Structure 1
Amino acid sequence: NTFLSCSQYHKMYRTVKATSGRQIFQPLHTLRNAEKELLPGFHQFEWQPALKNVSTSWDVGIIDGLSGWTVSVDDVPADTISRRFRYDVALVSALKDLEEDIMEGLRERALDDSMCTSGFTVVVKESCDGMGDVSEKHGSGPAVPEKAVRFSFT
């Protein structure tokens, strides 16, 4: 929430710990291990019936959006760099997040729990735009650091 970079974090961490006799923040490695429970590809799930032509695996994370582009030079090149998620897994992440809120909301509405297990419906918004010719540092020559199109949902 404050762009704070790892080197910084470790520095100020050692600083405050050796400063006043206590462990106020947590060190990196453990913070990150704890983090691994928030990115996509950490929760089990199921799908009934099974998805159509979608890998049954569930534990994957940050994938490459080329989608196995046969790198053979002759054909259209495969230099375009991209990163994305198995959409379904991104969903199950965001939903497992908002779990807390949906449970408290079932508590306000007083609706039963062993009877609200099925009839649910989530509405999904999406959007996609691109940023022009982004500026960056140490790029006097082109490293295609200009265009980016960020496809997203909420």
Structure 2
Amino acid sequence: TVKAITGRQIFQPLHALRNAEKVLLPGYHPFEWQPPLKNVSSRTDVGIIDGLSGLASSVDEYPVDTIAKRFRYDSALVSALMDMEEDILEGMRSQDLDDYLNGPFTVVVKE
């Protein structure tokens, strides 16, 4: 309606937003653990995956009737850290530190 009345593209179409979404969602930024994760793959492009984690759905074994969707924890934390980079940099600048510091950060979480 805005583009039809005004005649100027103040907002972009839906596909532009759909394309821009791929920057904030997890499984987009590269990373690497010091000591390789145990029993965990190294794919850094793992988005939304099935929550059943490959659970068998055959009629023979234990009947399962639940669906699930979830991210991968490590990619989730990577996306979370990418989301709040500006706040971390501002906190470093406020406490009279250097922006080029790379000391071991400590991040506590609440499940």
Match of 1:119 in 2: 104
| SS at 1:54 equivalent | coil
Aligned 1:1-154 pairs, distance under 5 A: 15-114=1-100, 116-126=101-111
Aligned Cα RMSD in Å? 1.1
| SS at 1:36 equivalent | helix
Normalised by the length of structure 1, the TM-score is 0.69
Normalised by the length of structure 2, the TM-score is 0.94
For the residues of structure 2 that align with 1:50 and 1:113, how far apart are their CA atoms? 28
CA drift of 1:71 comes to 1.8
Percent of aligned pairs with the same residue? 72
Which structure: greater strand fraction? Answer: 1
For the residues of structure 2 that align with 1:82 and 1:17, how far apart are their CA atoms? 40
8 Å CA contact 2:93, 2:99 repeated in 1: no
Q: Deviations over 1:60-115 (max 9, x none)?
A: 1001110111222111123210111111111110111011100111111121233x
The list of structure 1 runs, each at least 4 consecutive aligned residues, that deviate by more than 4 angstroms after superposition, is: none
Paired residues, what number?
A: 111
Query: Letter of the aligned partner of 1:119 in structure 2?
Result: P
